[PDB]
Amino acid sequence: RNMQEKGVSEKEILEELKKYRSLDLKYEDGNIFGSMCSNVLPITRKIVDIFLETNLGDPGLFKGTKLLEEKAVALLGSLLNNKDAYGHIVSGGTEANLMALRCIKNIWREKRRKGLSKNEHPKIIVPITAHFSFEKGREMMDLEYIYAPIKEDYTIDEKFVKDAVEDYDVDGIIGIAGTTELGTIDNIEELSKIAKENNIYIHVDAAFGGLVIPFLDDKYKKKGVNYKFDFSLGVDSITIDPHAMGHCPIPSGGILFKDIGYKRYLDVQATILGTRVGFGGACTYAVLRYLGREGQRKIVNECMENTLYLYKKLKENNFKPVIEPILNIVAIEDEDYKEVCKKLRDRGIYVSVVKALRIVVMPHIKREHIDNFIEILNSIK
Amino acid sequence: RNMQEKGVSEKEILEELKKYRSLDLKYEDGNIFGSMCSNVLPITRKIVDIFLETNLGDPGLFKGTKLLEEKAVALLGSLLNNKDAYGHIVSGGTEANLMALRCIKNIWREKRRKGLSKNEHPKIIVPITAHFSFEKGREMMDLEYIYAPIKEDYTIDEKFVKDAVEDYDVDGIIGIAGTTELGTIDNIEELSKIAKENNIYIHVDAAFGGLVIPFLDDKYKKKGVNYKFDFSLGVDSITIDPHAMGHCPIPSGGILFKDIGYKRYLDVQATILGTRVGFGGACTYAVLRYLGREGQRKIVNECMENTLYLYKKLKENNFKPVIEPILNIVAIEDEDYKEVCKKLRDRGIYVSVVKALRIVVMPHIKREHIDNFIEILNSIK
Numbered sequence: 138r139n140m141q142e143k144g145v146s147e148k149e150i151l152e153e154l155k156k157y158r159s160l161d162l163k164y165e166d167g168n169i170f171g172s173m174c175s176n177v178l179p180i181t182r183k184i185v186d187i188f189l190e191t192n193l194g195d196p197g198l199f200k201g202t203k204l205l206e207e208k209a210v211a212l213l214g215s216l217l218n219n220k221d222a223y224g225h226i227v228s229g230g231t232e233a234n235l236m237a238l239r240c241i242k243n244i245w246r247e248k249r250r251k252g253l254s255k256n257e258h259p260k261i262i263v264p265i266t267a268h269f270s271f272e273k274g275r276e277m278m279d280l281e282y283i284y285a286p287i288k289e290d291y292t293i294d295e296k297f298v299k300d301a302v303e304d305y306d307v308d309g310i311i312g313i314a315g316t317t318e319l320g321t322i323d324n325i326e327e328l329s330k331i332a333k334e335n336n337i338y339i340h341v342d343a344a345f346g347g348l349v350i351p352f353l354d355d356k357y358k359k360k361g362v363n364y365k366f367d368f369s370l371g372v373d374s375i376t377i378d379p380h381a382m383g384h385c386p387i388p389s390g391g392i393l394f395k396d397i398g399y400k401r402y403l404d405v406q407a408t409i410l411g412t413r414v415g416f417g418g419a420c421t422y423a424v425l426r427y428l429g430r431e432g433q434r435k436i437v438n439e440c441m442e443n444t445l446y447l448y449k450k451l452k453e454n455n456f457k458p459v460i461e462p463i464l465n466i467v468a469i470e471d472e473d474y475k476e477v478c479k480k481l482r483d484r485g486i487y488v489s490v491v492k493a494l495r496i497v498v499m500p501h502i503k504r505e506h507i508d509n510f511i512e513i514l515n516s517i518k
Numbered sequence: 519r520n521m522q523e524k525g526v527s528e529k530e531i532l533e534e535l536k537k538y539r540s541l542d543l544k545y546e547d548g549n550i551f552g553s554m555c556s557n558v559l560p561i562t563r564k565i566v567d568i569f570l571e572t573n574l575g576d577p578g579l580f581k582g583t584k585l586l587e588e589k590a591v592a593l594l595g596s597l598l599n600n601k602d603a604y605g606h607i608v609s610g611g612t613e614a615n616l617m618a619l620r621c622i623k624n625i626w627r628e629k630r631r632k633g634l635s636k637n638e639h640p641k642i643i644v645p646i647t648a649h650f651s652f653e654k655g656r657e658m659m660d661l662e663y664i665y666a667p668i669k670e671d672y673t674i675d676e677k678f679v680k681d682a683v684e685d686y687d688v689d690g691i692i693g694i695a696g697t698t699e700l701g702t703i704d705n706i707e708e709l710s711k712i713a714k715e716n717n718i719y720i721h722v723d724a725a726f727g728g729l730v731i732p733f734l735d736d737k738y739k740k741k742g743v744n745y746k747f748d749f750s751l752g753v754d755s756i757t758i759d760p761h762a763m764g765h766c767p768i769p770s771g772g773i774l775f776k777d778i779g780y781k782r783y784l785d786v787q788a789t790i791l792g793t794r795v796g797f798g799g800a801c802t803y804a805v806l807r808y809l810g811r812e813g814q815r816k817i818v819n820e821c822m823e824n825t826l827y828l829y830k831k832l833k834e835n836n837f838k839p840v841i842e843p844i845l846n847i848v849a850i851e852d853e854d855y856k857e858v859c860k861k862l863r864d865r866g867i868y869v870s871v872v873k874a875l876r877i878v879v880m881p882h883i884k885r886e887h888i889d890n891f892i893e894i895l896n897s898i899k
């Protein structure tokens with residue numbers, strides 16, 4: 138516990154660390170059911186080693202690692218239908234969302250300096266399903282949120298947004314492509330039309346869904362759900378995280394803006410962090426190149442196959458999924474959800490907690506794990 | 519540049535990445551003279567591999583990695599004379615400073631809710647030598663800074679601070695233990711007395727110096743410079759970064775608060791980031807344990823030996839250091855500093871840019887590199 142005068146040997150400290158690591162869960166062990174992280178693609182371990190001693194906070198010293206960040210951003214942009222995107226491979230979806238909020242706020246500041254806004258703080262429409270990073274941004278940056286309600290399918294009420302934009306002077310709209318709790322997809326196409334018609338910035342949070350939705354086989358797509366979310370809709374920015382469904386090591390988050398014109402509104406380097414990893418960009422570029430669309434499609438639809446297997450097994454055992462799954466996320470309605478979560482923990486099953494248990498069917502979740510999960514859950518009931 | 523349907527082999531993508539890495543500089547090659555990062559302790563590469571698939575954003579899944587973060591914080595706290603510190607191993611000094619600012623701001627908010635502050639925004643005294651992360655915080659969080667001037671020795675003017683605290687209602691004071699440009703140490707002892715006597719929060723930015731100052735041999739300490747900066751002075755928080763002079767891989771920053779009572783003012787998890795590495799805490803704990811005070815002392819004073827060698831060689835060659843060095847940082851006065859920096863770049867010497875060139879004598883800078891540097895600089899002149 139205290140700092141010591143004398144050092145210890147490598148063998149002593151590594152065996153201590155391994156003892157602590159043995160207290161952790163591991164993704165591959167059939168314990169973790171409620172996380173949007175998973176095992177990294179094995180090749181990334183080598184890449185992390187190669188790029189460990191780089192720093193994208195000083196890109197003039199690491200020109201190649203900086204180029205690889207630009208290439209990673211370009212590949213994500215291509216996936217999102219935008220060959221001119223301006224962006225960064227940042228620390229995660231939180232920093233990405235915070236940077237989009239900073240941009241929204243600085244567009245507002247410029248208006249305020251010209252007398253073109255009656256808002257004393259940026260006014261941003263945010264669905265109540267938004268990830269907590271949006272609350273961190275509100276709290277830090279003194280934003281005013283207009284919380285948008287959700288419809289029966291748990292997607293943002295587009296008519297509310299349109300009415301609010303008519304009633305109020307609005308500085309930004311947030312839409313979510315893959316909500317944290319349920320994996321639902323807001324109607325970005327309609328939100329983007331509202332935004333374009335009213336000259337309002339729109340940010341899409343695709344932290345999770347951005348690397349799932351473009352790869353979904355048709356049999357997993359649902360009638361009447363719109364899967365369009367990217368720059369083909371003319372949106373201003375998109376968060377999309379390789380360390381979620383991109384199989385990249387933390388920290389690998391992504392923020393893309395429609396073009397380089399947005400960079401000036403990130404002025405105070407454009408990232409929140411200063412000193413920052415170079416291996417995230419290298420891993421993001423390398424994994425997307427190594428897999429190609431074919432390899433990512435295979436992984437995404439394997440997860441969707443296991444998601445629909447879990448959904449089927451749940452109904453067969455008389456459990457009530459909140460919704461038919463859209464992405465590789467299923468939630469189980471339960472009034473005793475807190476106690477059931479604890480009882481599951483006691484038996485080696487870690488879900489997250491909507492009066493529901495959330496299951497994220499990442500690539501580490503296999504059929505045998507779902508079978509084991511159902512068996513344990515029945516026993517609890 | 520575009521996303522492709524077909525993937526590529528591991529050999530193809532690794533050889534592409536290695537070609538980009540070959541465009542980077544490497545710390546050990548005698549090129550990088552102006553960075554506060556350096557080579558990591560080799561043992562950390564193994565630790566990164568062991569802890570790569572952990573996430574301190576979900577510490578209930580990684581109990582051992584979470585304990586190692588707590589142990590890392592405790593070892594830093596012990597080094598800083600505080601066995602009860604509450605803190606986190608975060609992404610860097612920027613996030614650490616931003617968290618201290620959030621705490622300052624939320625203490626102010628509570629006062630505002632009670633009518634105990636006439637300030638419409640937190641008012642914080644910040645020396646003009648402060649790192650740019652403080653500007654990021656100001657810009658995001660709408661802080662009001664009272665910029666404190668520096669004295670002839672480039673440390674904060676304590677009389678200005680005292681006068682300002684008498685004149686104004688002040689919500690926070692920043693002092694720097696190891697300035698970014700010159701490595702100077704503010705008079706934290708006096709600033710802490712002012713702060714305590716007036717019930718003002720004081721944050722110490724020891725991002726760089728926190729892992730240098732406690733290890734300085736007496737022959738490097740200068741008469742009349744006060745080296746006291748830590749919790750023995752009763753300060754409220756300290757930033758201290760293992761990925762600077764702790765030889766830990768990015769991301770390994772540190773933020774410590776005086777006790778657990780500060781955690782409530784970080785409420786909106788207490789970090790800015792969500793999903794976040796677990797290997798920083800493991801590396802921080804392991805490196806401090808592996809080295810002990812003896813091993814870190816050896817490294818710090820080796821750097822100081824090379825710093826004073828560089829200082830001596832500069833004067834012998836008629837160059838004008840800005841100051842006699844305090845930490846392992848020397849700056850060279852030069853009116854043509856921009857052009858000289860570019861000419862140095864062209865010859866393989868990368869310094870940073872006070873009309874001066876900044877040299878940070880990290881552990882990768884050896885005597886032969888300083889000799890080579892002086893030779894090249896003379897030739898330019």
Ligand SMILES: Cc1ncc(COP(=O)(O)O)c(C=O)c1O
Pocket residue numbers: 173228229230231232234268270313315316317342343344345378390575791792793
């Ligand atoms: C929709 C969404 N956005 C953003 C985030 C934040 O991502 P991170 O934890 O990488 O900061 C989350 C994390 O899962 C999320 O679900």
Ligand SMILES: Cc1ncc(COP(=O)(O)O)c(C=O)c1O
Pocket residue numbers: 194410411412554609610611612613615649651694696697698723724725726759771
């Ligand atoms: C004094 C000081 N504080 C904070 C920082 C920010 O640290 P980071 O780049 O790790 O965010 C710097 C970086 O060197 C610094 O010099």
Ligand SMILES: [N+]
Pocket residue numbers: 171172173174573575576
């Ligand atoms: N998680």
Ligand SMILES: [N+]
Pocket residue numbers: 192194195552553554555
């Ligand atoms: N640097």
